[PDB]
Design a protein around this ligand. Sequence first.
Ligand code: F6C
Ligand code: F6C
Ligand code: CLA
Ligand code: CLA
Ligand code: CLA
Ligand SMILES: CCCCCCCCCCCCCCCC(=O)OC[C@H](COP(=O)(O)OC[C@@H](O)CO)OC(=O)CCCCCCCCCCCCCCC
Ligand SMILES: CC1=C(/C=C/C(C)=C/C=C/C(C)=C/C=C/C=C(C)/C=C/C=C(C)/C=C/C2=C(C)CCCC2(C)C)C(C)(C)CCC1
Ligand SMILES: CC1=C(/C=C/C(C)=C/C=C/C(C)=C/C=C/C=C(C)/C=C/C=C(C)/C=C/C2=C(C)CCCC2(C)C)C(C)(C)CCC1
Ligand SMILES: CC1=C(/C=C/C(C)=C/C=C/C(C)=C/C=C/C=C(C)/C=C/C=C(C)/C=C/C2=C(C)CCCC2(C)C)C(C)(C)CCC1
Ligand SMILES: CC1=C(/C=C/C(C)=C/C=C/C(C)=C/C=C/C=C(C)/C=C/C=C(C)/C=C/C2=C(C)CCCC2(C)C)C(C)(C)CCC1
Ligand SMILES: CC1=C(/C=C/C(C)=C/C=C/C(C)=C/C=C/C=C(C)/C=C/C=C(C)/C=C/C2=C(C)CCCC2(C)C)C(C)(C)CCC1
Ligand SMILES: CC1=C(/C=C/C(C)=C\C=C\C(C)=C\C=C\C=C(C)\C=C\C=C(C)\C=C\C2=C(C)CCCC2(C)C)C(C)(C)CCC1
Ligand code: SF4
Ligand code: SF4
Ligand SMILES: [Ca+2]
Ligand SMILES: [Ca+2]
Lengths: 80, 42, 42, 172, 172, 31, 139
Amino acid sequence: SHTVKIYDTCIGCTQCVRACPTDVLEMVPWDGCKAAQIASSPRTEDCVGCKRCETACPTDFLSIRVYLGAETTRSMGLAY
Amino acid sequence: DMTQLTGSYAASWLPWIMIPLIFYILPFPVFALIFIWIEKEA
Amino acid sequence: DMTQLTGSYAASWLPWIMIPLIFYILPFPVFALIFIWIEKEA
Amino acid sequence: KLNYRLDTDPVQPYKGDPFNSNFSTAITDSPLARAFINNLPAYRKGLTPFMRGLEIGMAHGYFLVGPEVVVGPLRETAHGANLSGLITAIYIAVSACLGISIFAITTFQGDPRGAYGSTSKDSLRPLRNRDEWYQLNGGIFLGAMGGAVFAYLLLENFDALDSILRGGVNVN
Amino acid sequence: KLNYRLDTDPVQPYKGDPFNSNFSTAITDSPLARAFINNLPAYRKGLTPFMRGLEIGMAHGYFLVGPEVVVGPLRETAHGANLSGLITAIYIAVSACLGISIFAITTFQGDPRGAYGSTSKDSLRPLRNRDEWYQLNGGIFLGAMGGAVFAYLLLENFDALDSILRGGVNVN
Amino acid sequence: MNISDTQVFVALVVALLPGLLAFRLATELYK
Amino acid sequence: TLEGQTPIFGGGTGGLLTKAEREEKYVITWTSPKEQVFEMPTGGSAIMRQGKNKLEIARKEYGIALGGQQLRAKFKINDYKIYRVYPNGETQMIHPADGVFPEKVNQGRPKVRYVDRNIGSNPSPAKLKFSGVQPYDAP
Ligand code: F6C
Ligand code: F6C
Ligand code: CLA
Ligand code: CLA
Ligand code: CLA
Ligand SMILES: CCCCCCCCCCCCCCCC(=O)OC[C@H](COP(=O)(O)OC[C@@H](O)CO)OC(=O)CCCCCCCCCCCCCCC
Ligand SMILES: CC1=C(/C=C/C(C)=C/C=C/C(C)=C/C=C/C=C(C)/C=C/C=C(C)/C=C/C2=C(C)CCCC2(C)C)C(C)(C)CCC1
Ligand SMILES: CC1=C(/C=C/C(C)=C/C=C/C(C)=C/C=C/C=C(C)/C=C/C=C(C)/C=C/C2=C(C)CCCC2(C)C)C(C)(C)CCC1
Ligand SMILES: CC1=C(/C=C/C(C)=C/C=C/C(C)=C/C=C/C=C(C)/C=C/C=C(C)/C=C/C2=C(C)CCCC2(C)C)C(C)(C)CCC1
Ligand SMILES: CC1=C(/C=C/C(C)=C/C=C/C(C)=C/C=C/C=C(C)/C=C/C=C(C)/C=C/C2=C(C)CCCC2(C)C)C(C)(C)CCC1
Ligand SMILES: CC1=C(/C=C/C(C)=C/C=C/C(C)=C/C=C/C=C(C)/C=C/C=C(C)/C=C/C2=C(C)CCCC2(C)C)C(C)(C)CCC1
Ligand SMILES: CC1=C(/C=C/C(C)=C\C=C\C(C)=C\C=C\C=C(C)\C=C\C=C(C)\C=C\C2=C(C)CCCC2(C)C)C(C)(C)CCC1
Ligand code: SF4
Ligand code: SF4
Ligand SMILES: [Ca+2]
Ligand SMILES: [Ca+2]
């Protein structure tokens, strides 16, 4: 499965979660930013690696990073 | 020559192949088909 | 004569059999061995 | 105001399941198509795997001889052309049987992947056991070799058989 | 003061049992020896008994034609030499298959004696059922006949094959 | 005057020695 | 068991395959206020029924696309659930995981795969040679 990491520069804009096409991400309570929420990746087994979350991330550099790893059926996006 | 079956008509090989096929090649498979048809359990 | 493959070198019958063996006799069994090797379950 | 009109549709969902990636067409579901396909030796009900392979091999080995006899590189002479066609059928059938063997070796390990697993419902691939594949392969090889030789013998004796089918053997 | 030094012994007891009348040697237990022997058709995992016999017969019938062709009493003429080799292979294979049949008839009565009994653990003799021996015998005969005929056809057409393998068929 | 039949056969037998040693090295590297 | 009526659909070529019966399958269920036409994730148009619907889909992304981009965005339907169905019959509800949609922060959700530094402070791979740890996984 792919690895999705969230760094402490997250501002809790929820854009990565809204952009994920397989619901890998969710918003969890936090205190490091004004929004009082940070992105989390509890379901990286469903991650396909599309990197839509990175495109949605407004911070510089990215607060969310996807590292492509071992390929499974669902990470390859295979319906067969 | 008149020592063999021949044909001056077009495609004289057609009887050559079709007489065996209709009369002693396909008829046994056709009988098998009919026999399977008439023996099928309800 | 130049109508056939021949060999003036020693044991010219060797290419007569070794070329078929390496190129279209053994390769399919070799591919079969490799296919079994790369599909074996852990 | 929405009328899918499925009840009068000439093309229905396959086997009543609209989400199985298939349609009920003339090719897939007509009475003649089903009768022909399901009664081919691959699918005929009750056939042992060896008997399936025997009929398939007979049919395929018989016609595989032909192409090299007519348009092959030994076609200039009758004796050479027939031999090349027989060898071509033997080489293809042996290669196919080797492929069938290694297919059975690799597919049936533990629970097979894909359509040959325990929970698979693929009606078009009913040979779900390793033993059935090896029995099928034995029938395929023997049938293909026999059918190829049968075509080879008829072609080798074509001069006699042509006289046979014209009555030239009835002169004396 | 006693040092058997078994821990550093290049030759170990076979399969960890020192009292099974065997050694772990390069012939009996090396990875290449085990891979080659256990994957011969007599031992290949998952093979049906008929498919085992088909491959064994195919190989043996093929090479059994050769000896009488080259040094036989009909070696003076090519056509006679090939026929004698084919007949010799047929006679030997049929004799072997007859011996296999009567082996199955006499061995499998009640609980078989020796290595084919229920409690026997002979790993080198895995065909423990009468049905397996008859299925093997059918494959042995058909494979031997096919292999012998295949060698017979190649030898009978050796002039054509020799031109085939030299490109002499490409003149016309 | 090229080599004879015996020399070709001797080379074939000699080449078996690096052939077997290549197999031994390949399997050892596979471990 | 999952309850609901399948949407009106005459059949398609983009439905389930061998993977559905062999490895896993997905089901999306939702309730609609009226009978209306929606686009199937793999092509074609279907008609969702008056009550509660049940649609079988080959991939989880099909459910997220259908529920998110069509049900929520276009039909104002917010009660859709996605289930993963295994061949042995066990069914688990995977979306929304805890009944609250992931884009809305919910109490009790832990931080998963959080790195307590900026991305520029990841160690160089030379420091982690032969240890098996990636720079992003380093403490
Ligand atoms: C490339 C391409 C190509 C080529 C090339 O060009 C070819 C060729 C060729 C040539 C060689 C021959 C002819 C020759 C003449 O004319 O003269 C002789 C005749 C006679 C001898 C004939 C006689 C009569 C008979 C014996 C009868 C028959 C029987 C049957 C088999 C039975 C049936 C049973 C059931 C009912 C089925 C042939 C034949 C063929 N086929 Mg070919 N081919 C191809 C293809 C194909 C395909 C696809 C397919 C489908 C599968 C096919 C089929 C078939 C069949 C069935 C056949 C027959 O019968 C024949 C024979 O073999 O024979 C022996 N191909 N072919
Ligand atoms: C007294 C002894 C003795 C004798 C006498 O002296 C003999 C002889 C003889 C003569 C006849 C001939 C040659 C010929 C000439 O040169 O020319 C032709 C060629 C050709 C045609 C060739 C062509 C090419 C081909 C076809 C190829 C091959 C194929 C394969 C079989 C396949 C393979 C498969 C897998 C991979 C294995 C032969 C042959 C033989 N072999 Mg003898 N032998 C003996 C022994 C043995 C043993 C032990 C063993 C092991 C078992 C053996 C094996 C074998 C084999 C494999 C063989 C092959 O091939 C060939 C044939 O058959 O053929 C057709 N021996 N061989
Ligand atoms: C009812 C019409 C009829 C009848 C009785 C015959 C009779 C005959 N044809 Mg023939 N033929 C016909 C129409 C007919 N033909 C038509 C329309 C064609 C053109 C497609 C041909 C083409 C044809 C060829 C190429 C050859 C014959 C040959 C023959 C002879 C041997 C039988 C055979 O091989 O059939 C072969 C039959 C066909 C190739 C196709 C026949 C198509 C017709 C229309 C089928 C009729 C079915 C029938 C009405 C239903 C019966 C119902 C049942 C209750 C009785 C025999 C004298 C052979 C011959 O001359 O031997 C010396 C031969 O080689 N026929
Ligand atoms: C790497 C060296 C090398 C190469 C590239 C070739 C190339 C060739 N040889 Mg050859 N040969 C070699 C060494 C080599 N030879 C040696 C050392 C011998 C003495 C045992 C022979 C004996 C020989 C005969 C008797 C015949 C050929 C023939 C041929 C030709 C067809 C191929 C064939 O049948 O091979 C046959 C090869 C052998 C019988 C044994 C080859 C032994 C070498 C050392 C194996 C090398 C393996 C290689 C290094 C590993 C590759 C690793 C991979 C990652 C690429 C081809 C031009 C044929 C010919 O002349 O056709 C016209 C033929 O009949 N060779
Ligand atoms: C010396 C041992 C030996 C011999 C004589 C044969 C002979 C045969 N095997 Mg076989 N086989 C062997 C070992 C052997 N095998 C081993 C160890 C395996 C395990 C991978 C297999 C797996 C196997 C399968 C899966 C199948 C055969 C089949 C066959 C038959 C058709 C030819 C073919 O497809 O080859 C295929 C051969 C292999 C995949 C591996 C062969 C390995 C040996 C060591 C080759 C030795 C050749 C040697 C180097 C040069 C001698 C020949 C040359 C002088 C002409 C033929 C009778 C086929 C059959 O039954 O046809 C219906 C078939 O489907 N074999
Ligand atoms: C004319 C040449 C034709 C093609 C060459 C022959 C191809 C097949 C040869 C090997 C088959 C059996 C494999 C080992 C038998 C066997 O079971 O080995 C077992 C060995 C170790 O396996 P594992 O570590 O998983 O342990 C499994 C245990 O059962 C054994 O330890 O794994 C291999 O497959 C070996 C390495 C791969 C293959 C290495 C390269 C192949 C040889 C290269 C050199 C060739 C020289 C040729 C000289 C004539
Ligand atoms: C025909 C037929 C059929 C079927 C069959 C089958 C299913 C088959 C299969 C087959 C197969 C399944 C085959 C296979 C093959 C294989 C191959 C062809 C392979 C190759 C390989 C290679 C080439 C390799 C490479 C490599 C690697 C990977 C690594 C190392 C390096 C090297 C380079 C060596 C049926 C039954 C329907 C019916 C009857 C007829
Ligand atoms: C679909 C269809 C069709 C088609 C068909 C086809 C495609 C056919 C083919 C056919 C074929 C292609 C056939 C074949 C057959 C074969 C056979 C019949 C064989 C036999 C064989 C034998 C009998 C052998 C024997 C042997 C052995 C076993 C061993 C020893 C040697 C010998 C040789 C004796 C048509 C278009 C018309 C119409 C429409 C529908
Ligand atoms: C080759 C083969 C095999 C098998 C083998 C076997 C198992 C065999 C058996 C065999 C047998 C099992 C045989 C038997 C024989 C017998 C005999 C040879 C007998 C004789 C007898 C006699 C000579 C008699 C005498 C007497 C008596 C006792 C009493 C009265 C008087 C008199 C004098 C008559 C195997 C599977 C591995 C693989 C494939 C190939
Ligand atoms: C151990 C080893 C070795 C040895 C090897 C050997 C010993 C081989 C042999 C081989 C052989 C000895 C082979 C054979 C094979 C065979 C075959 C491949 C056959 C085939 C057949 C066929 C294909 C047939 C067919 C038929 C039938 C079935 C019926 C009808 C008629 C006909 C003819 C078509 C060496 C020293 C080198 C090296 C080291 C290791
Ligand atoms: C003459 C004669 C004979 C025969 C012989 C023969 C039959 C031979 C053969 C030979 C051969 C046929 C050989 C071969 C060789 C081979 C080689 C030498 C190879 C090598 C290779 C290498 C070095 C590489 C390796 C590697 C590695 C290390 C790893 C990875 C993989 C590879 C594979 C790349 C006899 C004794 C019977 C008798 C007397 C006379
Ligand atoms: C009916 C059917 C079908 C269809 C089909 C089609 C439509 C087509 C096919 C086609 C095909 C499938 C074809 C084949 C072909 C083949 C070939 C073309 C081959 C050739 C070969 C050769 C030429 C060889 C040669 C050789 C020899 C003889 C020996 C050694 C050396 C060499 C290698 C040179 C399917 C599958 C869907 C299903 C089942 C049934
Ligand atoms: S890479 Fe794609 S699937 Fe993975 S977490 Fe990011 S948006 Fe979701
Ligand atoms: S898009 Fe970037 S900044 Fe916004 S919540 Fe996701 S990780 Fe944080
Ligand atoms: Ca007469
Ligand atoms: Ca030519």
